[model samples]
Target: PFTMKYVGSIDQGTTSTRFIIFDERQRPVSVHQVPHTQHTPHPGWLEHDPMEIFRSACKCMSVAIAKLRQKDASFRKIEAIGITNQRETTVAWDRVTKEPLCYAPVWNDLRTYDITKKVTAELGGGDSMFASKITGLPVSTYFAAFKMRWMLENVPAVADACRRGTLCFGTIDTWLMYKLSGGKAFVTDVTNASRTFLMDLRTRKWSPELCEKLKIPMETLPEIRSNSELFGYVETDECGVAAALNERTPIMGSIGDQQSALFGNMCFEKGEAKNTYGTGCFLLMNVGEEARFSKHGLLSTVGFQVGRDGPCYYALEGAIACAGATVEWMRRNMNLFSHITECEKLARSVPGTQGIVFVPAFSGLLAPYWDPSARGTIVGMTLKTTRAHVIRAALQAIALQLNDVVGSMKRDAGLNLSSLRVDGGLSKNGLLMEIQASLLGVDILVPSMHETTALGAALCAGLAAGVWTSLEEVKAVSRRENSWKTVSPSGSAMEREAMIAEWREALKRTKWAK
Candidate 1:
């Protein structure tokens, strides 16, 4: 009976790298999260040192493995490994040297603005949604292709690789698997590949027409695979990982961050949903296997696929560029308070926002509204407008944006979002959960465990390696053992109506871009 099994998840994010190891009971045994630099170039470009990211994962893996071994003397090695990464971050590398062509352009970088607009106009006939019918996404800087286009034009090294047919392109998932497997796995999953705006949502393959039209060499793209399968082995010797992991563990799970949380949260059925309140925020609702097109600005993306050729699930997504960032901005930029607890304390200090409505569209508005011109705005303030009220209003804006996005998704997908499972650093905020619950008129579930995203990747890996049998078994285990706190609607319809109305009016005043 001492043949115990465990799974390791590499939660590679935008600002950090994390390794969370879970026992058979779905409980986190040990975790090591290492922060990395968010390198900001001179011209609105966000970059990352490729090696720094890889090393952080390696060190985290080394440390977390040691911690688990210390805790459990019987711990031999992980059965399988999973990877969930920040979606859309573009990484171009050389297939020969297996080296990074340049620093990865983060998902949120705006350096692709010119390239995005040019492609939208030239190829899309001024219709950004030209290819959305097939790819289920619009022309935006958030997707990987624009970033790849920017790299090809600006980075000479990347251009040379492209001409020499030695260039490889992928999202963070592709990069991590490539690095972790020591360059043996040059592959990506449908969820991560979909964010590239080059994958056909129906066929789950790269579109040849778009490749030629967009001028990206089809060969540069990696082979798209399902989320759960045998990806590769932990063969890299970096950071003593090979020594720490004595067994040659298989790498199985590879999914985008939001989709991973959806899987981990057990939102496997259609209409099931989850929201991630991270530095940015995402709301995803499973819409079943059919590729549902979005007319309301929400992205239609592949949710997850279980096996090598498993039944695929599609999801509708809405993203907000500011969520936890709004809270951090209030604390550090506005000096509203020192610690994060005080941000909530001060927010809960007031009964409500009184009359002020905040629109925390710092980066711009996404989903339903689709206003890149929109910026942050707060209206209906007076002498009674205290810092507490502003802080509370900031929280309100996050919920308000989701309400609008959800409204659109409902219309587009012809389905209603059943319930929302919430996670991430900001999801722990009691006041925000209450606000989100009340505003959406639905009960919100906050998992006692914070590593739900990590769990998704682990679940995928475990499934692939036969650590668990079926999705039903996975759900039963979590349901029986996992404790979830539900926050119900606490607002009156009158109050909710007033809050939503004030937000709609405030949003109209948010357009300031030239």
Candidate 2:
């Protein structure tokens, strides 16, 4: 019998950090999560303490490994580690001291809006100019390059480091790898690099022209590698999970969270798609070999590259600025409920939102509209609206956002979705899933394992370490789960259409609020 070796994954997300341990069967055996602080110094700025995030990742890894030891005496069976993180969140650190120069600008931070517009103007004053042709991203504040640009121009420490040639720029994955390997590696994978607007979509390497346009130093950037290739090695004492592994382990996989969800959902074929509902909502559809550009407001990005010699897979992505965060706002800010369970109960209590449509654009509307000026809005509110109605409206807003993304995806890719594979913290809500199904008019598939993003990282690491020999083996392991529930559209087609039209009107109202 083949002795199964386990793999570990670090899931560094927007609101929390987690370390999950998985066996050769690709099922998570132990998991630990820690919530981190999100700093808003000003109205449109979102930041995270780089050191705190780093420390939390290490802590989560230690805790998860300790739990795994209870089941198996040798929890050191973990052979390799992988990482997946919130894409495009930019961090700057000192090359000599390895300390973060400033707080990392989060993916949702819109402080770079002016900088993005400036770049657009420099690149010929159109969204579909030379930059888009090279990078597959429009002029937007939602990318790593824009954040880096902001840091270089605004932060004194960052500006000094850049001039001194001692500045290092990385997304969360690159930061984690750099620290984990004790500075041996400062690299990011194709999936993560693609989100930066610095990598050439066709070449999968950092673009010199884009770098020059942004006035960013090319030397500060990490080398781009395949998603499943060996990144570096980490010793037990160096960082996360190594103390439990008891030896030096290879770090094999690095992918963005959304791309990881796509892989974890097994959307390996062209036209297959998945939606992840986390702090934000992302809809990604695999577009196969050719790099496809979106005429719609969708982003064209790398899905995942298997290895050094593997084919480059591309995807069309629709990013909704808010999803679970809206739910959190209702719980924390609105005092609607102390727990998410309470919110769910309240939502089910209401027959519906009672025509109240909530457009959650806390960070601004992304996809289809691409309006950074758009503000959050609630339409059709009446005196009859209760807390239950408002909560239901928040959840409905999530589903409606997905509908917007998928609708644009269909137009650009010419692929109609029969169903959508879903994962994330918000995907657990039965009411949300039911609404998503009803609004999209397609069956919604939820996997038994909600940590598909983490699982995707584990699978990539397992593949690189030869724990799993091929994609077929990976698929076989996934199919063995046999754990999925399908939610079909319950509302009448005419009713759903009417709801969509009203939701469109509500989206317009949000723009008007600006």
Computed on alpha carbons, the lDDT of every model, listed in order, comes to 0.90, 0.86
Model 2 poorest 10 in a row by lDDT: 235-244
lDDT of 1 by residue, 1-514 (tens): 6667899999999889999999888999999999989988767889987878899999999999999999988888899999999999988999989889999999888899999989988999999999998899988888999999999999999999898989999888888899999899889999999899899999999999998899999999888899999988989999999899988988999999999999999999998999998888899999998989887878989999998778999998988888888999998999889987998899898998988888888878877888879888888889989999999999888888888888888889898778899988898899989988888888899999778999999999999998889999999999888999999888899988988888888988999887
Q: Please list the residue runs of candidate 2 whose C-alpha ends up more than 4 Å from where it truly belongs after superposition.
A: 126-130, 236-243, 331-356, 360-363, 381-390
User: For residues 254-372, what per-residue lDDT tens digits would candidate 2 score against the true structure?
Assistant: 99999998988888888888988777778889988888887876788899889996988999998787888899988888898997799889999978787798887886777887776
Which candidate ranks first by TM-score, i.e. highest?
1
Q: Model 1: runs farther than 4 Å from truth?
A: none
lDDT value for candidate 2?
Answer: 0.86
| TM-score for each candidate, following the candidate numbering | 0.97, 0.91
lDDT of 1 at 291: 81
